[PDB]
Amino acid sequence: GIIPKKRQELMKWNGWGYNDSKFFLNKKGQLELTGKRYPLSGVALPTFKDWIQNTFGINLTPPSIVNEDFLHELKKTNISYSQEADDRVFRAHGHCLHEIFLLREGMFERIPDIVLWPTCHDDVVKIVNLACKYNLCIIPIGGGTSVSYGLMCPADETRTIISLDTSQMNRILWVDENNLTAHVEAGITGQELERQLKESGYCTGHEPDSLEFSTVGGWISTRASGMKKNIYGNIEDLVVHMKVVTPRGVIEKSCQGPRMSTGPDIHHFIMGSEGTLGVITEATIKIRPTPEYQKYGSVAFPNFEQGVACLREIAKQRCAPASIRLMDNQQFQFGHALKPGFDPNQLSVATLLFEGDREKVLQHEKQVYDIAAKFGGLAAGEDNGQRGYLLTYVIAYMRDLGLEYYIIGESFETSAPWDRVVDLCRNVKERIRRECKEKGVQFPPLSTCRVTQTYDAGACIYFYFAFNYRGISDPLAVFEQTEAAAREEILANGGSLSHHHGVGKLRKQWLKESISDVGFGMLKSVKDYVDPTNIFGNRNLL
Amino acid sequence: GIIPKKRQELMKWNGWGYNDSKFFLNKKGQLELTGKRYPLSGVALPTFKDWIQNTFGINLDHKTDTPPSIVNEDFLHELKKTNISYSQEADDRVFRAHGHCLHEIFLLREGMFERIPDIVLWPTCHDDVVKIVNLACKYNLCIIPIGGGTSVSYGLMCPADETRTIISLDTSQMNRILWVDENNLTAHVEAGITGQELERQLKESGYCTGHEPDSLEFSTVGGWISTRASGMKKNIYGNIEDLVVHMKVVTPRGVIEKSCQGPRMSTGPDIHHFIMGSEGTLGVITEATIKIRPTPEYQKYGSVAFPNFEQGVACLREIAKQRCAPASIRLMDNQQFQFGHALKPQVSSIFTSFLDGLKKFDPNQLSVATLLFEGDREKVLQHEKQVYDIAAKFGGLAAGEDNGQRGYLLTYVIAYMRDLGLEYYIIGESFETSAPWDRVVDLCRNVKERIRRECKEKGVQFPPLSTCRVTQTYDAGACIYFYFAFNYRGISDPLAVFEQTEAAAREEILANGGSLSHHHGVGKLRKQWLKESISDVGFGMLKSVKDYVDPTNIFGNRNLL
């Protein structure tokens, strides 16, 4: 999983993922994913077309402005660079819906002027120094998977914009098997990181759904959350050490002690900084011996409410498996539709992934079914759970499909206290229906949720919103506005601005209310100290 | 659990803890703790005296005004109108001019502080703290918050050249539990509540935080947050940074508070971490929400002996490797094992030597781990079996719940032993670090040797007591806790000698890959290593926050920076 410099060689220039992976109608008229990459690749999905048709009512470049002394100086460094249109455009965006439109059927207002590929910490230092000398703006990019407009170049940035691409700074530097830590360069992808560690019998277990492309550096910048955080932690639990290149100089602690009291933890000044302060060049991450065994599972509940109560109880007992997700009825129908009692309009389903030693797994599993049983939960099968999880890496490919048929969609997320979850889900799902009907959407949108992570004090709730934009004169406007209304509803119902996606430029307008005016001023004060001239000018957060 | 305004009524004006609790020689000549507060209170310790004598070479029988209150009269008038209680009394000011570092206790015992608070205030709620901070801006006052007064980093010491009126802003009357959210398992509390009072009140509704630092009788929620406190049972409950879900902070710039109680967010750098570890330099933490748990149904103590310390460390490391650490596991070195042996009740022969006594009862090599499990009875007992099976693989032999039980009770009594030692020319202090697993054994060996070399070089006559234990396990390493003591007779400046040996031990720790601090923090004791520890830029970032939040340095204890 090493991303080539010319990403378009391997990855779609106008959508998610690998060129060799796209949904298509096979020779029996059923949807199937092309290629051989995924466990679902080449697997007929006989009832998927039907689900779609039912749900959605369908039938189925600016020049590079660059100082020449800067270019001359960059040449002496031997850092690879490009002023080519296709390289700059590829890095002008992440994976928000509006972005994917300007990429497809249009053009962006502002794209990087020059792409650089540092291969190490010292190259990054050179680049930041050049940027100070020539007054250049740096927007770091790893995987390019931001869903927060975090990579968008500000339209009125008139400095030369360097896309500082970390994909070629991608080595494991050392694996410390005495301490179970691995020190890595921050451009390594999740997939490559896990592939290499596995060969030595280790894993990080950090598995965001973006792992094929998202990077260590990206995870730390956005406070990324992984599917197995219950065992391995989120990124703030995984990172033991980091090295950061700012215009002021290099941030690094002098020791690898597991926990300190040496004033406010400066690691948390950089985590969540969203490329506004400097470049995370290296990090030390906790590793674990690869689990012996993995088992999937599922549980049906009479309704969503009972499911929530069961996840809560599971959280209260602190016996969550590696992953536990609760799907509302719509997502359950969706899952059922991708295969190769109770009131059925409200029936909910949890999917389970257990991992560890086989005997402890088996024992754990029994415990979880016994708890579920007390909330009306019924074992619903391993193959079901397993399919739910094997879907994880393909959903991203479904947009491109949808777009071909005038279906537009996006997911969004929040975290909320346990006592707000049920109301928040209902109220947000209802708000989306209402806004859509009021803006002229002809068919009630898909408006669905799942509880995706559990904590002592609450849960991450993950929503999908999508609609057939038939007979709508401004579909992107309608979409933007409804998604902003959804957000408003989430905040009204006690939900957070973001669980894991981050703020970028998409949720900027709510940050000050979320963290307080003095909080905002604290973030500003660090920004102005570390980067007084705003070299790191993506304008995320603040 | 409530700390009274005139603390010296309940607590010792000149040393640790409650007035009713000191070590004395009983009518048999045995050391015993007065009072009835602890399980060991009124329990004779017949070999303790022998151990003291053998360790420090003393006989034991042979024993061992103030600056005026400078305060503006208009401020005083405005303060009278708020009905916030206050005091300019010297006993009230002196009590809050220090924590529990050795030098501070010396200056109490045989001297005077260079600088003490000019006035003490007792806010009773968040709005009172806002009014006080408003007045400090208006009259240009310096505020040093105090909760428990249990700092071991010079974090409460008033800087000698601070010429502004110093307010000791005592949080002890802001001690309520504001709500208990049983749906989300969180409690929202005022910051001056002590750990003992917090646990007692919560247990009445069936809950606990399980945050149990050895100072919990006096240390407060606000204290814990300021200093990144670590508790004995963090393996179950977390350290303070895992326990806090929410906080409210009064700064000169305004009030910090997030607008929601979501369990985990990605909304930029986590500003809770700007506050955690701020050591009273930014503002007053007035309230916090803390995760709670059902009170555990059952506790099980235990102990395991290993052939040596190194085998004990390998065992703890494997326990950490399989992520099955109990509520608490602590590995003591052989000297601490001997010490523990010397606080038991069976009266030995005066003619059989102690070392031979102990041996009859390699005993100069053996190390002992003490253990606490708590939770559901079923799970606790399965878990204990699991840990004891791992320990068997490293030569570990079960050593009795009795010793585990005694180990855990001693934790709250040891602090009273300073007061005792100071009566007999013995000074010492504990200190700590965290370190990667692969540095632990070498670090411990090397620090103990440095301390021996340094004492000898500085004229100390007896070899110092210099002992260690591993008090916490993490995935990436351990917390190491040291005790250092010596008889100071024949030394001309014993504080200088201690001070300089302490600093040299610290240099040795850092040179062995240890941290500057695991939990005690920086205060004004470790400031000179801080830049080196967190980098020049990282230091500049803390300074940028201080300069923004507290531009005129109202929170002027001068800790950290």
Ligand SMILES: Cc1cc2nc3c(=O)[nH]c(=O)nc-3n(C[C@H](O)[C@H](O)[C@H](O)COP(=O)(O)OP(=O)(O)OC[C@H]3O[C@@H](n4cnc5c(N)ncnc54)[C@H](O)[C@@H]3O)c2cc1C
């Ligand atoms: C299909 C899909 C699935 C996803 N699943 C998850 C998930 O399960 N969990 C999750 O948390 N998120 C998820 N995301 C969001 C995204 O993957 C994460 O936010 C991820 O952490 C971004 O990593 P990246 O390397 O792609 O960063 P990029 O998108 O390249 O950059 C993100 C931000 O960080 C900055 N940045 C990048 N590298 C560095 C660096 N080395 N130093 C300093 N700043 C830098 C950038 O300037 C930018 O502001 C998903 C996204 C998609 C599109």
Ligand SMILES: Cc1cc2nc3c(=O)[nH]c(=O)nc-3n(C[C@H](O)[C@H](O)[C@H](O)COP(=O)(O)OP(=O)(O)OC[C@H]3O[C@@H](n4cnc5c(N)ncnc54)[C@H](O)[C@@H]3O)c2cc1C
């Ligand atoms: C015998 C003994 C045992 C100990 N055991 C432990 C232990 O197990 N674990 C551990 O981590 N530490 C321990 N300590 C150290 C100490 O108790 C902790 O650092 C504790 O967190 C301090 O709490 P406090 O309420 O006593 O704070 P104080 O000592 O009163 O204050 C400490 C610092 O925080 C500031 N402060 C206090 N309250 C506030 C507030 N509300 N807002 C802003 N700033 C504030 C003060 O200005 C000062 O800088 C121990 C100390 C002793 C003497």
Ligand SMILES: C/C(=C\c1ccccc1F)C(=O)NCc1ccc2[nH]c(=O)[nH]c2c1
């Ligand atoms: C864009 C999209 C879905 C979609 C497609 C068509 C119609 C409607 C939609 F919501 C989608 O899910 N992409 C995968 C994705 C995105 C962000 C994620 N965050 C996670 O934690 N995991 C993430 C996964």
Ligand SMILES: C/C(=C\c1ccccc1F)C(=O)NCc1ccc2[nH]c(=O)[nH]c2c1
């Ligand atoms: C000072 C001392 C013991 C002592 C007494 C006389 C001579 C030498 C000494 F080292 C001691 O341990 N006090 C209790 C104490 C202090 C700080 C602690 N921090 C912890 O985590 N736990 C703490 C416990």
